[PDB]
Amino acid sequence: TGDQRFGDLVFRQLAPNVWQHTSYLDMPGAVASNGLIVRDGGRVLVVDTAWTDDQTAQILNWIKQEINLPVALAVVTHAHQDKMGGMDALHAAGIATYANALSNQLAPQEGMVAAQHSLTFAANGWVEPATAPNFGPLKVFYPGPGHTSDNITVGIDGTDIAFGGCLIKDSKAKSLGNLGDADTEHYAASARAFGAAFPKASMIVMSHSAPDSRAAITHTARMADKLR
Numbered sequence: 551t552g553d554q555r556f557g558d559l560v561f562r563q564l565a566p567n568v569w570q571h572t573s574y575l576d577m578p579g580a581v582a583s584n585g586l587i588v589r590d591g592g593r594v595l596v597v598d599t600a601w602t603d604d605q606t607a608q609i610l611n612w613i614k615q616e617i618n619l620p621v622a623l624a625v626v627t628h629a630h631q632d633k634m635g636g637m638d639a640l641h642a643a644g645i646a647t648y649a650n651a652l653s654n655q656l657a658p659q660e661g662m663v664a665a666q667h668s669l670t671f672a673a674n675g676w677v678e679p680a681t682a683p684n685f686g687p688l689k690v691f692y693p694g695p696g697h698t699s700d701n702i703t704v705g706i707d708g709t710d711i712a713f714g715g716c717l718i719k720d721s722k723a724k725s726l727g728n729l730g731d732a733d734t735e736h737y738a739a740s741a742r743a744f745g746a747a748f749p750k751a752s753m754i755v756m757s758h759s760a761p762d763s764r765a766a767i768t769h770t771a772r773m774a775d776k777l778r
């Protein structure tokens with residue numbers, strides 16, 4: 551209970567300044583996609599678009615009318631439709647968009663529109679600060695290939711929250727979902743690297759489940775072990 555709707559796109563509050571935006575697409579069943587909205591000082595930061603441009607425009611309208619702070623940047627966590635399907639709506643609103651350089655390189659073949667800006671990463675997985683200017687509380691981390699080769703993750707400074715995207719499944723999941731683009735061999739390690747990158751996080755947000763505990767990370771690596 552307690553999950554606010556606006557148009558067709560649930561917002562749920564996670565922390566006083568972190569909302570979960572949820573949109574739905576129908577996979578002829580229906581499927582939820584989760585993303586984040588972050589209030590940091592006098593601007594708004596977004597993580598992940600919705601499945602489509604119209605849903606993404608709704609997210610923007612909402613920010614305008616529930617937060618009323620202008621959207622500074624948006625970060626998308628890889629080149630899949632649940633994360634990137636709404637790029638045009640972001641660009642029409644003139645919002646600076648960032649993704650892993652690799653996500654941007656793969657976006658055309660994945661049917662997605664590229665972000666305007668490319669994030670690069672060090673060998674230890676942390677984002678190069680100068681490719682991510684003014685991200686504020688957003689801490690961007692590339693844990694290695696897993697769900698896709700380009701998947702990145704984001705921690706929120708000043709919260710128990712880290713966002714795993716489609717990389718992490720929930721603690722009671724019966725599978726790792728879509729392994730279509732998966733790196734089987736490195737998945738377990740990547741799931742574990744995300745865990746270790748945000749060691750103090752206890753609320754883990756993922757793409758198709760309510761926020762879960764760290765058991766989500768542990769369980770996902772367990773399942774991925776059985777792959778390799």
Ligand SMILES: [Cl-]
Nearest residue numbers: 722723724725
């Ligand atoms: Cl499941």
Ligand SMILES: [Cl-]
Nearest residue numbers: 748749750751
């Ligand atoms: Cl942490």
